[PDB]
Structure formats: structure tokens, C-alpha cells
């Protein structure tokens, strides 16, 4: 099939059809209630949550050479 002859495989039609559906799936995406919520969870909320925690706690601590009677809290 390709430029260089390979071994003979039992190219299963069902598995071939499955691997083509995956490669073509992007053409059939649609905006629905489900697809809008999932795409909003992963892209906005969860990243903005991490960004909130990263922003809120940036500089909150330093562990370097901390001793008894001296806290880890930096701010």
C-alpha cells in the first residue's frame, strides 16, 4: 500500500473503519448543551481554578533553611 513493500497483514475491515472514523471525527463536532459544558469545564473553569490557586499562593512560602520558632508562611 505504501511506497515500500511491507509484510502481509490481515487488515481487518472493522478496525480499519474504526481508525478512519477517529481521524474524521473532528468534521462532525457540534455545539450542544453537553459539548458546550464539557468544553467550558476543561478550557475555562479548571484552568482558571489552578490560575486562582497559583496566583493566590505565589510567594506564600519559603522552605529554605527554616528552623524551629520560624514559620514557613512568607506573606
Partner 1 sequence: PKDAVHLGLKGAAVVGGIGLLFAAVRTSLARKNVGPWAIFTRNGKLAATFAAVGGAYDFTRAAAANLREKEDWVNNGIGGLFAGATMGLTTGRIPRVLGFAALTGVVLATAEYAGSGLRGVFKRDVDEYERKEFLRKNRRRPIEETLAEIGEGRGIKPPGYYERRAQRLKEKYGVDINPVCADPDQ
Partner 2 sequence: FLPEAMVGRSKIDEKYPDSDYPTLTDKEDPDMNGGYI
Partner 3 sequence: LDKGSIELFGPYGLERGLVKLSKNISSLSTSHVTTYALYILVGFILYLIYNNLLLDYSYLLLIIILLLLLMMIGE
Q: How near is the Cβ of 1 to partner 2 at its closest, in Å?
A: 23
Angle of CA points 68, 73, 75, to nearest 5°: 140
Judged by CB under 8 A, the chain residues 5 through 64 that form the site for partner 3 are: 22, 25-27, 29-31, 35, 38-39, 42-43
What contacts 35, CB < 8 A, 6 or more positions away? Answer: 29
Does 48 help bind partner 2 (rule: CB under 8 A)?
A: no
- Check if the beta carbon of residue 63 is closer than 8 Å to that of residue 72: yes
Does 25 help bind partner 2 (rule: CB under 8 A)?
A: yes
Residue numbers at the binding site for partner 1 (CB under 8 A): 31, 58-59, 62, 67-71, 73-75
Amino acid at each position: 500500500m505504501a511506497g515500500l513493500q511491507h509484510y502481509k497483514i490481515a487488515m481487518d475491515p472493522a478496525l480499519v473503519r474504526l481508525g478512519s472514523m477517529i481521524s474524521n471525527r473532528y468534521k462532525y463536532f457540534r455545539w450542544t448543551k453537553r459539548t458546550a459544558l464539557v468544553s467550558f469545564m476543561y478550557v475555562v473553569v479548571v484552568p482558571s481554578t489552578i490560575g486562582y490557586l497559583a496566583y493566590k499562593t505565589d510567594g506564600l512560602w519559603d522552605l529554605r533553611a527554616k528552623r524551629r520558632g520560624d514559620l514557613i508562611s512568607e506573606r
